[PDB]
Design a protein around this ligand. Sequence first.
Ligand SMILES: Nc1ncnc2c1ncn2[C@@H]1O[C@H](COP(=O)(O)OP(=O)(O)OC[C@H]2O[C@H](O)[C@H](O)[C@@H]2O)[C@@H](O)[C@H]1O
Ligand SMILES: Nc1ncnc2c1ncn2[C@@H]1O[C@H](COP(=O)(O)OP(=O)(O)OC[C@H]2O[C@H](O)[C@H](O)[C@@H]2O)[C@@H](O)[C@H]1O
Ligand SMILES: Nc1ncnc2c1ncn2[C@@H]1O[C@H](COP(=O)(O)OP(=O)(O)O)[C@@H](O)[C@H]1O
Ligand SMILES: Nc1ncnc2c1ncn2[C@@H]1O[C@H](COP(=O)(O)OP(=O)(O)O)[C@@H](O)[C@H]1O
Ligand SMILES: [Mg+2]
Ligand SMILES: [Mg+2]
Lengths: 102, 185, 400, 398, 96
Amino acid sequence: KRELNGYVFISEDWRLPALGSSAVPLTSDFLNIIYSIDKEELPKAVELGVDSRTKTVKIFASVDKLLSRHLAVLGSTGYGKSNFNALLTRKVSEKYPNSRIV
Amino acid sequence: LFKLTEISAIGYVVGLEGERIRINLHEGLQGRLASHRKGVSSVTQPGDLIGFDAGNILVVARVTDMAFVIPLRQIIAYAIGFVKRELNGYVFISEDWRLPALGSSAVPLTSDFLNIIYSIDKEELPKAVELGVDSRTKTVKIFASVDKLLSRHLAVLGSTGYGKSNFNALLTRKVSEKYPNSRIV
Amino acid sequence: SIYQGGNKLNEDDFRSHVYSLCQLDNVGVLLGAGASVGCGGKTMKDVWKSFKQNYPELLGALIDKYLLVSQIDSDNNLVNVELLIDEATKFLSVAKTRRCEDEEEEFRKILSSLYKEVTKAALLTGEQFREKNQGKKDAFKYHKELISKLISNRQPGQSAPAIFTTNYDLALEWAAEDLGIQLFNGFSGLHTRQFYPQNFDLAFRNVNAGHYHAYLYKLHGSLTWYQNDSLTVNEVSASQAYDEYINDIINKDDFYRGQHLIYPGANKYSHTIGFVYGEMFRRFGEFISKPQTALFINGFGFGDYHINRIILGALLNPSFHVVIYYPELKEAITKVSKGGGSEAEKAIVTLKNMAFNQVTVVGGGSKAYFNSFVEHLPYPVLFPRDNIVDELVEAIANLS
Amino acid sequence: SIYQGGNKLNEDDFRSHVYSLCQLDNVGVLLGAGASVGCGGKTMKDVWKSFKQNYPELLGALIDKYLLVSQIDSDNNLVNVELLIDEATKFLSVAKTRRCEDEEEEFRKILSSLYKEVTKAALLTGEQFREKNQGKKDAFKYHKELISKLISNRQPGQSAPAIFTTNYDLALEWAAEDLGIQLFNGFSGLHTRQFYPQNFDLAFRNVNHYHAYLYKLHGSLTWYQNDSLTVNEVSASQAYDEYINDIINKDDFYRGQHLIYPGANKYSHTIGFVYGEMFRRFGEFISKPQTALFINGFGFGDYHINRIILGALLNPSFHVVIYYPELKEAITKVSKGGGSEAEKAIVTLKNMAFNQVTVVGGGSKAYFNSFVEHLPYPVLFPRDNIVDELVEAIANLS
Amino acid sequence: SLIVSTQRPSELSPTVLAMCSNWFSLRLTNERDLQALRYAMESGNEQILKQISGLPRGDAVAFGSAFNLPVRISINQARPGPKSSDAVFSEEWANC
Ligand SMILES: Nc1ncnc2c1ncn2[C@@H]1O[C@H](COP(=O)(O)OP(=O)(O)OC[C@H]2O[C@H](O)[C@H](O)[C@@H]2O)[C@@H](O)[C@H]1O
Ligand SMILES: Nc1ncnc2c1ncn2[C@@H]1O[C@H](COP(=O)(O)OP(=O)(O)OC[C@H]2O[C@H](O)[C@H](O)[C@@H]2O)[C@@H](O)[C@H]1O
Ligand SMILES: Nc1ncnc2c1ncn2[C@@H]1O[C@H](COP(=O)(O)OP(=O)(O)O)[C@@H](O)[C@H]1O
Ligand SMILES: Nc1ncnc2c1ncn2[C@@H]1O[C@H](COP(=O)(O)OP(=O)(O)O)[C@@H](O)[C@H]1O
Ligand SMILES: [Mg+2]
Ligand SMILES: [Mg+2]
């Protein structure tokens, strides 16, 4: 729906369309709205990658909601755990130069 | 000069297959909204409630299916009880073994009949506390009796960060201001 | 005091029983002359008092010469008024046929006084009888409620309610013309109204998809029925009847025509008049011989042998139910227990003593009146119990 | 400001209610003279105010000698103009049929002055009433938005919007001819255009959202009756050359059964037919179930329209929304004692305990330029105009 | 009288849960945490259990002896509320 001059995405799943309604494909503009954050955590957001299916929408995450409780990284051997750990640690150290990491 | 009903119709019953009911809609209705004296109501989406006029009682049903069959439209519903008038008010009963007859009309449920369904006995009003509102329409208020809640044991379940503590705080605070000579630990 | 098979039950059980009887295949109501006393009517024993107070000279010649009425019945006010007019008419016809000139005037003088008394007690409005919109007054408030309750609790694919009555006043017609319902009484036309016995098997329907009609059987006639110079039966309006023959009956003192009126059960010996009376009784008998019938009786005095015989014979069917109102049960029970009272009391007590679950009797004086009878019937849920049209009508009238 | 059912409402609930009403089976709009002042029009008060100033010699005769207008309403500026014109036309016809030469010349001047005054205020662009593409200008920005919103909110299989009006100017046709929509007004043909009442039962269909209806209850500037007993319609550029340039810049009035505005010549059985048809079609519309109506710019001074509106509330499925800026003045003047018929009529329907009646008032929150924004846009409706940027390049190519 | 609040209904004694008269339930997304709720209550209702898997924040489903029929409620906010939260890393890391 619309809020002031743009759009927002709500995540409730009990509303259904009506009979006779037409179906349209989703343009890349609405995919950016669906996979966004709440318009205020951008100053404390970190980029991690791009979506896999289309490779056109960037993905961000909030440090406060990410490094609040424990975090888990799992996977088999030869698939890229160390890459992820190094990237996250380095680009967290860069943003907050007064942090403690062991 | 005779007015048997002050509400408009939506469809009519065309078949019964046990405990499920089948309804065909009129030609004009396309916009999923029906208007009456008190306002506008939605009658097509699944999960809504509709009613039938069967003599001197009103049957209540819940919508499940909706599909084509200018093409016609069809609805399948299931009954959950009936509403009765006894002296000067109304009462709701929760037995669903009564069904309407062929040719009966289907009508929407206004906000006054919705109050009767989600209501308690009148003599227990001073012994009641307020919790919230109806989720689907956000018009009716919900009450419950304290003597029937905190008589046996009560359970509250949920995941993290969804509102267990808020509900606990509200429920515990509302009781103390009502029964000051009570013990809570 | 409520009895069902010789045992007592409370008010709540009686109301529950009444609720279950209103959802059967057939529903009917039979009313008497006691149901019109709240609108301005009089009972059958209040007319004999007036007759014997206003005309004390004909009473002696009506007992000592022609033996048309007993002294015991007259002294206790237990005379069947409608059973005397037919005999008087027969006497007058015989005297006219055999040319006994001195005997014609005497019987023309007593009929003129009997009609003058019976007619004045059935107007219900005095001289406001030729006007219009008589149903808007407060006297006919419960007739409308009864009619509305009977119609508004029938499911589709079911029969229409039937009403039988022993009155000959215009109360029910006035009540029905205000709600907008149409009643079938066997007549059709506007400029020449005629009686057709085959129009009792008709009903309305909608050409697009209403079911607002009922049947009214009048067993003793009406004020507005008369036989013209030809051999046919016609019906007119209240104003036309008042301007034609009612005003002279009430006011003039030497007016009597002959075999003209069709009330009450007067000219049965003519074969074009009794044909009207026979059909109503035949169709009453046909109605209560149906598998799932329920009948309500109120206002009746149980002084008719034929109706009692018909009702008694119809109870040997395991799916017939009757409810009776009689606000004098105790005064009849004592009199029957000691020595035995009148025939009506004996009949009602014998019917009460039956050990069936089909017969129910209610007494208690003012607790078994016509007004109390209505509230025992159920009230529909969707009926609008508010006032929205009147305000808009008044606002429209206020404009300009 | 906002009253529903006798009690008050806030902005958000009112906006939600407005959105819910547009999704019913039938949607209609009634517009008055107040909806044309944003593009160059005038209100009925101003017309009388200017006539009284410009022609003081003729004012005394209408009050003293002929008794057509009273003094209190003339001093208060609460006169009705179309009724006056109809009565003057009837007077002139009666005077002509009995050969009274003195009275015949007296009413020609009156009618000429009245027609000059009313016509000069109906032209919304002055001398540019002849040229084409008049709807491309900025004054008609909201007339386009109203039609676009009122068309785009209909699902397939539903009806088309209906537009009633009491004006006799060419604003809506000019607005519609620029978007690319077609309006049914009851006429057909080009070289000889005639009035057919059955043209309102037709619709368009594609053999491989196009049309709307327009009802004018007081006529139009481009309608006239010739010697033939049929009504004709022509274009603005032809009316200007035929009979409009003489009304303003000349003292010309010699045909008494020619013009069909405003509500004049009702004594002829050929002209009253159009008015009767329009009024009957208006009446038959609001008797349908599931109907919603909006009123804006119409002062409640007509008896018959008020009677028609009130009687339709007896049906459970009829709803209406009314806009009236000067509400507090009426409330105080009827509570204190006094007031004209319009104030009493609006107040009596404001106090009713009905949920089918809603009244919105204010000082500038109840104008026509604010009524449009209360109506929403669909989510997928296109708004960015990127087609004129290409037409300009095509023209630059030369 | 007892009020029990837990987020893992499966890690409880079945008797304790089966001896209650009323139940309030918020969002619950786990296949083994729904079997316990199904077992605790009596049979005869299955269309009400599908909603729990997708209830939004602040909504709950209530069914028991003090309610005539199951209802989906939107709960009011308490004022004043309980303690807000724990420490926030960003504020302390940017206090140079
Ligand atoms: N306000 C009242 N409400 C109800 N019942 C009343 C009331 N007042 C009196 N009653 C009762 O109303 C009754 C009065 O009955 P009557 O009018 O004399 O008798 P009928 O109308 O059957 O006479 C006509 C028939 O009888 C002939 O034999 C012919 O065959 C006719 O067919 C008593 O029970 C009163 O207690
Ligand atoms: N910008 C504006 N926006 C909206 N409303 C406005 C505006 N300016 C003024 N108004 C209001 O617009 C209204 C102006 O009322 P008038 O033009 O005299 O009335 P009518 O158009 O019905 O007159 C024609 C009718 O008269 C006969 O009765 C027949 O029925 C005719 O059809 C006032 O409320 C102003 O406050
Ligand atoms: N996102 C990525 N893009 C490109 N190469 C990757 C990515 N993730 C992992 N790799 C490749 O995986 C190889 C080793 O992965 P490694 O960090 O050893 O995984 P693990 O620690 O799970 O064995 C590297 O040579 C690197 O090129
Ligand atoms: N019904 C509600 N309405 C509004 N806010 C709520 C509601 N329930 C929870 N919240 C918000 O959620 C936050 C914390 O939720 P909380 O109840 O602590 O989750 P948990 O159930 O895991 O304890 C609070 O700050 C409160 O503002
Ligand atoms: Mg590694
Ligand atoms: Mg918590």
